[PDB]
Amino acid sequence: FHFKEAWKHAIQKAKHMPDPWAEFHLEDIATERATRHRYNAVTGEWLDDEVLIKMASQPFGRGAMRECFRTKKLSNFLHAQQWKGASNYVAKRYIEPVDRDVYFEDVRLQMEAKLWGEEYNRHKPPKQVDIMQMCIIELKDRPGKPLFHLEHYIEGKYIKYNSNSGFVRDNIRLTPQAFSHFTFERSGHQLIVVDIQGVGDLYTDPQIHTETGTDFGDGNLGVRGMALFFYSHACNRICESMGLAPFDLSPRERDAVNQAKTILRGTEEKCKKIGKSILGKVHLAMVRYHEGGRFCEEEWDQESAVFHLEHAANLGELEAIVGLGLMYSQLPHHILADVSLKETEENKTKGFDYLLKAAEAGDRQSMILVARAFDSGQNLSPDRCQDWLEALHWYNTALEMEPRYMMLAREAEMLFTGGYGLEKDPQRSGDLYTQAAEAAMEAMKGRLANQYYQKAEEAWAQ
Amino acid sequence: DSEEEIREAFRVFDKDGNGYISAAELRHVMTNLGEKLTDEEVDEMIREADIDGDGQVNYEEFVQMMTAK
Numbered sequence: 131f132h133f134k135e136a137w138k139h140a141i142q143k144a145k146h147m148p149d150p151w152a153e154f155h156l157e158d159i160a161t162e163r164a165t166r167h168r169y170n171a172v173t174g175e176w177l178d179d180e181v182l183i184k185m186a187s188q189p190f191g192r193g194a195m196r197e198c199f200r201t202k203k204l205s206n207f208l209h210a211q212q213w214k215g216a217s218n219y220v221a222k223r224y225i226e227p228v229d230r231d232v233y234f235e236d237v238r239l240q241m242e243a244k245l246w247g248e249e250y251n252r253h254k255p256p257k258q259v260d261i262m263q264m265c266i267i268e269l270k271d272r273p274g275k276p277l278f279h280l281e282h283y284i285e286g287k288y289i290k291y292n293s294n295s296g297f298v299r300d301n302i303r304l305t306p307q308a309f310s311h312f313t314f315e316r317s318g319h320q321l322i323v324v325d326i327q328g329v330g331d332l333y334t335d336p337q338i339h340t341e342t343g344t345d346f347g348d349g350n351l352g353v354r355g356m357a358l359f360f361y362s363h364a365c366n367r368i369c370e371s372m373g374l375a376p377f378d379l380s381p382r383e384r385d386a387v388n389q390a391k392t393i394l395r396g397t398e399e400k401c402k403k404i405g406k407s408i409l410g411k412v413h414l415a416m417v418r419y420h421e422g423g424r425f426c427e428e429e430w431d432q433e434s435a436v437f438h439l440e441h442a443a444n445l446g447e448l449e450a451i452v453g454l455g456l457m458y459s460q461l462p463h464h465i466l467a468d469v470s471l472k473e474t475e476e477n478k479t480k481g482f483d484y485l486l487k488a489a490e491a492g493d494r495q496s497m498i499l500v501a502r503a504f505d506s507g508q509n510l511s512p513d514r515c516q517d518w519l520e521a522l523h524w525y526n527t528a529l530e531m532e533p534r535y536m537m538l539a540r541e542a543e544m545l546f547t548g549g550y551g552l553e554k555d556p557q558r559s560g561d562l563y564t565q566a567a568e569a570a571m572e573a574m575k576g577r578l579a580n581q582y583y584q585k586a587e588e589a590w591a592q
Numbered sequence: 593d594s595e596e597e598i599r600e601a602f603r604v605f606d607k608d609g610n611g612y613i614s615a616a617e618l619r620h621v622m623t624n625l626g627e628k629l630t631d632e633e634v635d636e637m638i639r640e641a642d643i644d645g646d647g648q649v650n651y652e653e654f655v656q657m658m659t660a661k
């Protein structure tokens with residue numbers, strides 16, 4: 131105990147420090163009874179107890195969704211605390227009414243983010259962090275039995291270092307941004323803790339984006355929320371001290387991002403197919419945001435969007451593989467619709483290869499396009515050849531997955547005559563014409579069905 | 593009286609009231625209290641009392657630090 135005196139000197143200073151909220155005379159407010167609900171994130175269990183509170187009638191601060199009230203509360207850890215010594219607390223409530231469960235899920239959010247702060251601290255960072263415990267008080271005597279969040283008051287300059295929508299703070303501090311990036315890496319890209327705000331490195335009201343995007347309330351923007359973070363994230367020495375992999379940004383994006391007191395200590399420690407798959411979805415989310423104007427600065431950056439569409443396709447995102455296959459094939463496309471790529475023989479090989487990959491991954495649209503390429507040569511790469519057996523393999527795969535009777539009748543046509551490596555099979559041609567006739571009846575194309583039945587008899591008459 | 597006194601002392605440093613004094617909380621309290629200590633002395637104050645090695649100081653570890661003649 132070479133610091134026991136340092137503890138005492140601080141304890142004595144505190145006994146002589148004045149209450150920063152003395153001027154507000156919260157002790158004069160009529161006392162109110164409340165049930166407090168405190169959460170344990172490791173066990174998932176709740177502990178309830180009865181408390182006495184004195185809450186100001188008017189909020190001293192607010193945001194877009196929540197307002198804060200100055201509050202005093204007696205401790206149930208102390209045995210005989212008088213109101214003259216009550217600690218200072220901040221009570222928070224949603225400005226517009228929300229469902230009661232929101233208050234409980236917000237506590238789960240904050241306490242889960244508190245666990246991630248403890249994980250970050252276990253990697254020996256230059257500056258440690260802590261997320262303030264938040265609980266729920268229930269004012270059962272008030273009209274409607276309203277719920278409030280409650281936490282201890284942290285005196286000092288309240289600063290929002292980042293948001294849940296891409297904002298970054300201008301005397302830039304390294305620790306808040308490194309913590310957020312750490313949670314992305316350490317969780318295997320399954321979550322990120324953002325909206326880092328508070329006093330110093332004591333944080334409150336954080337937000338978690340998850341891969342599913344189903345928990346932690348409406349602030350969970352999913353992989354879109356991770357994209358907003360990494361669009362403006364400049365990795366710092368803490369990010370690299372812990373071996374956090376940088377996000378692959380475009381040349382224009384990296385320069386705009388590249389367009390500090392916290393120093394390393396040499397003790398920082400270092401922090402899967404699922405993550406690379408989530409990483410692909412984060413890249414695809416950047417594409418949609420570029421197209422949607424979220425990254426406005428001139429005109430929407432088409433080159434950076436394509437940069438992220440290729441990274442998404444290379445990471446396995448089927449929507450990106452289909453999109454690039456159509457774009458390199460000079461075909462209409464949904465993603466980056468107004469963007470066109472230069473027609474070149476190299477790209478026409480890439481276009482078909484992407485469409486073939488997408489076909490082999492289950493995309494019905496690519497399977498019909500690949501079938502037609504092997505059938506008629508349309509959109510077929512010049513490295514390949516018309517192959518009617520291969521075309522059969524992709525028509526029927528689409529049928530077993532536009533009109534089905536059209537593809538069934540086409541298969542029968544090819545088998546009635548043969549060609550391009552496919553040997554004729556009249557019996558199968560009549561069978562497929564029969565399936566097409568039945569498919570035409572289910573589509574109310576009765577006259578077309580009679581034609582298919584007649585073509586079936588002719589194929590069998592051979 | 594000294595028991596409550598120690599309990600009140602623990603609440604001075606357990607800034608969020610979760611039962612554990614963290615290094616970040618101790619840094620905030622020492623800075624707010626005007627006490628002049630480097631960011632390393634704060635981490636050492638935690639490590640000296642951290643018997644279970646979880647990086648934080650619970651009440652019992654705090655008691656053992658204060659009631660250790």
Ligand SMILES: Nc1ncnc2c1ncn2[C@@H]1O[C@H](COP(=O)(O)OP(=O)(O)O)[C@@H](O)[C@H]1O
Nearest residue numbers: 168169170177204205206207208608609610611
């Ligand atoms: N989430 C929790 N679940 C259970 N017990 C808790 C929890 N957080 C703190 N405690 C216990 O309660 C004590 C603090 O009680 P109290 O002073 O009534 O809280 P506050 O400081 O929030 O007013 C802590 O020292 C610890 O023993």
Ligand SMILES: CCn1c(=O)c2cc(C(N)=O)c(N)nc2n(C2CC2)c1=O
Nearest residue numbers: 191192193196220281282283284334335
């Ligand atoms: C709704 C988010 N939020 C807080 O959570 C918050 C917490 C504390 C605290 N625990 O001390 C504080 N002092 N200030 C806060 N503010 C600022 C308006 C004043 C906030 O916006």
Ligand SMILES: [Ca+2]
Nearest residue numbers: 606608610612
């Ligand atoms: Ca604490």
Ligand SMILES: [Ca+2]
Nearest residue numbers: 642646648649
């Ligand atoms: Ca400990």
Ligand SMILES: [Zn+2]
Nearest residue numbers: 311365366369
């Ligand atoms: Zn980083």
